[PDB]
Design a binder for this molecule. Structure first.
Ligand code: HEC
Length: 251
């Protein structure tokens, strides 16, 4: 979630240009962003974002069932740029944005907007209203060509802030040995327990939560770190760049 990024990285964009969502949403899926090639000072323009994905395909939910995906993003604008205030946003534009509540990454970083989690069904495409700055007032911005960084995500991440995996990833054998048994868990608890008899006869038991499907069976021998399930993840993260020129009016 965008809040996980806000709570674990002062700056969402790393030196090499990679966005921190990429530290937990490990699969890549293309995204697109579009802004006008140029804008006048203190003006309201729009950024249009695409977070494409097949909506017929469902993901593994936290509870282990299948279901809809949620989207979120981070928009890194130049110093000085900021979310357009409600009163400066055209009604036609207001309707386009919908019931979305963009927010600064931090109170001190008003040029970094985030949003989500929100339903992917209705927000596969998002419109963000930005207020261009004015160098004639702000010493920190000039009439240049500025870069714009974007990061969009679809689906539940594979790793939590504490470092543990979610149920939306590949599970591997904790040891090498023969699979002596595969017990399904409850009916409400879901998942399976895969008992592996090691060379020394000791039997370890790998717990696999509901979500991913098994690709092994009783009698099969596996190596340590060998995948026991498929890769359930159907979401993805993506980054895109663009740029905008901050025009200099001339009277
Ligand atoms: C690792 C510490 C993470 C960071 C950094 C970010 N996300 Fe994340 N995200 C993470 C997990 C483990 C999950 C699943 C949580 C759960 O309880 O199931 C998520 C989930 C989201 C979602 C929800 C999608 C859904 O289908 O429900 C969204 C839209 C999302 N994350 C977006 C997102 C963005 C844009 C981030 C960067 C700004 C980002 N996440 C970072 C783990 C982590």
């Amino acid at each position: 979630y965008p809040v996980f990024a806000q709570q674990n990285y002062a700056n969402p964009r790393e030196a090499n240009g990679r966005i921190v969502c990429a530290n937990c949403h490990l699969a890549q899926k293309a995204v697109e962003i579009e802004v006008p090639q140029a804008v006048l000072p203190d003006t309201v323009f729009e950024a249009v974002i695409e977070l494409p994905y097949d909506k017929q395909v469902k993901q593994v939910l936290a509870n282990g069932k299948k279901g809809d995906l949620n989207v979120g993003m981070v928009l890194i604008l130049p110093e000085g740029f900021e979310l357009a205030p409600p009163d400066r946003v055209p009604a036609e534009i207001k309707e386009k944005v919908g019931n979305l509540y963009y927010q600064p990454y931090s109170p001190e970083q008003k040029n970094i907007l985030v949003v989500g989690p929100v339903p992917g069904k209705k927000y596969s495409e998002m419109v963000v209203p930005i207020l261009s700055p004015d160098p004639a007032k702000n010493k920190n911005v000039s009439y240049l060509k500025y870069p714009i960084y974007f990061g969009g995500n679809r689906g539940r991440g594979l790793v939590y802030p504490d470092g543990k995996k979610s149920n939306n990833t590949i599970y591997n054998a904790s040891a090498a040995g023969k699979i002596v048994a595969i017990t399904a868990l409850s009916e409400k608890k879901g998942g399976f327990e895969v008992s592996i008899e090691k060379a020394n006869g000791e039997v370890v038991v790998d717990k696999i939560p509901a979500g991913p499907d098994l690709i092994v069976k009783e009698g099969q021998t596996v190596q340590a770190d060998q995948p026991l399930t498929n890769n359930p993840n159907v979401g993805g993260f993506g980054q895109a760049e663009t740029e905008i020129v901050l025009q200099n009016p001339a009277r």
